């Protein structure tokens, strides 16, 4: 028992890859509880480097996934690779490891898969692994700024909720797009756009924060930026331009299950950015008090926000509170905090974290969001307000 969780890594591009700059550090501070033991990447060439650059002592590299999926040295594998390849990958990992039994945890990232269906399946599947805990990466949930809200409310610091208001930004579905940005982000069919990811991330944290799921809801999706601007590496725009399929703005309203509390939410695609308002805001109207979170980057999942709250200390004498944590690295800090939740339970199976404070979210979570996201999609399309009170099942 008591010795490092060994992580197998899928999507470890190099010493300057996403994961590299996030997951690796979540594990370096938990060197004590996690060791990285295997890197999958198609060309061996690439794992070995990664290793030599990162100095992954315990790392041993793969060429085959199946090759990978079998190393009984991996208690837990982390798949952080394009969502579109999300289905392919995972699926196999699942069928090839059956024999492996230390593999005890399979971590993956929002969105779990690229289409509900796709995901549904991977879920349907995950299920058989009686010994398998699945983990979706909704780092939203672990932000000091969320938990804090969560705390505040739960303890009736703002009474019952009345209304909620929301604002976001996809960032790249603006009138501007960056040199580096993956074409697939903007390729419709991708299964990667505003809602799915950005908003899915968002909204969930609020179902998460309020700790209530949706009952009914309505959505409307726009596509008024049909061709955007290309930006030179520095951000200087350039006379060059390209088409976009993924949508530029989405409106959504719905009535929360708990309270029939109503929800307003307008999500901008990207640039230009709101200049008279925070591009990221949660406005909760309680009975005894108010709670406002604000970021300039709608990437709460990644973002270091600030929280203003005002109401009763405990829960007539209202009080003001400003929760901002200067220089907190949310970018990395937040995956780290999930890793913890895992060691916890580990060095200390689950269904979903749902509304719970401890633990961490699962494919069951991954799913519900997922399922609820279709809803929004079917909604706009059907131009109808549908009940999302079965999703939780």
């Amino acid at each position: 028992s008591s010795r490092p969780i060994r992580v197998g890594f899928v999507g470890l591009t190099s010493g300057k890859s996403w994961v590299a700059k996030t997951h690796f550090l979540a594990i370096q501070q938990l060197s004590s509880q996690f060791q990285i033991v295997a890197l999958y990447n198609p060309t061996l060439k690439s794992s070995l480097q990664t290793i030599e650059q990162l100095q992954l002592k315990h790392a041993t590299g793969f060429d085959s996934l199946e090759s990978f999926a079998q190393y009984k040295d991996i208690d837990m594998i982390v798949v952080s690779v394009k969502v579109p390849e999300h289905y392919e990958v995972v699926k196999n990992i699942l069928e090839h490891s059956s024999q492996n039994l230390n593999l005890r945890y399979l971590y993956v990232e929002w969105a779990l898969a690229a289409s509900v269906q796709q995901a549904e399946e991977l879920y349907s599947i995950s299920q058989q692994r009686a010994n398998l805990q699945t983990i979706i990466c909704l780092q939203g949930r672990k932000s000091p700024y969320i938990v804090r809200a969560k705390e505040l409310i739960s303890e009736g610091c703002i009474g019952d909720i009345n209304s909620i208001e929301i604002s976001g930004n996809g960032g790249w579905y603006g009138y501007e797009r960056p040199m580096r940005s993956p074409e697939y982000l903007y390729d419709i069919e991708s299964g990667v756009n505003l809602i799915s990811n950005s908003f899915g991330h968002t909204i969930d944290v609020l179902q998460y924060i309020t700790g209530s799921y949706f009952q009914k809801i309505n959505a409307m999706i726009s596509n008024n930026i049909p061709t955007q601007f290309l930006l030179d590496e520095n951000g200087k725009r350039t006379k060059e331009t390209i088409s976009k399929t993924c949508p530029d703005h989405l409106l959504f309203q719905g009535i929360l299950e708990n309270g029939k509390v109503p929800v307003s939410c307008s999500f901008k695609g990207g640039t230009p950015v709101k200049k008279l308002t925070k591009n990221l805001v949660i406005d909760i109207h309680g009975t005894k008090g108010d709670l406002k979170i604000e970021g300039d980057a709608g990437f709460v999942e990644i973002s270091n926000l600030v929280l203003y709250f005002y109401g009763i200390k405990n829960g007539e004498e209202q009080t003001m509170e400003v929760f901002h944590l200067r220089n907190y690295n949310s970018v990395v800090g937040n995956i780290l905090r999930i890793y913890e939740s895992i060691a916890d339970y580990h060095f200390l199976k689950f269904d979903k974290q749902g509304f719970r404070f401890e633990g961490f979210p699962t494919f069951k979570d991954a799913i519900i969001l997922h399922r609820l996201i279709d809803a929004v999609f079917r909604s706009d399309k059907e131009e109808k307000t549908l009940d999302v009170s079965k999703i939780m099942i």
């Binding site: 950015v273 604000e294 300039d296 980057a297 990644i302 270091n304 200067r326």
Partner: peptide, 14 residues
């Protein structure tokens, strides 16, 4: 003073 997250940054790390 608030060190909040600017999208400009976001773009760098992502």
């Amino acid at each position: 003073l608030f060190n909040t997250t600017t999208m400009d940054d976001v773009y760098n790390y992502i």
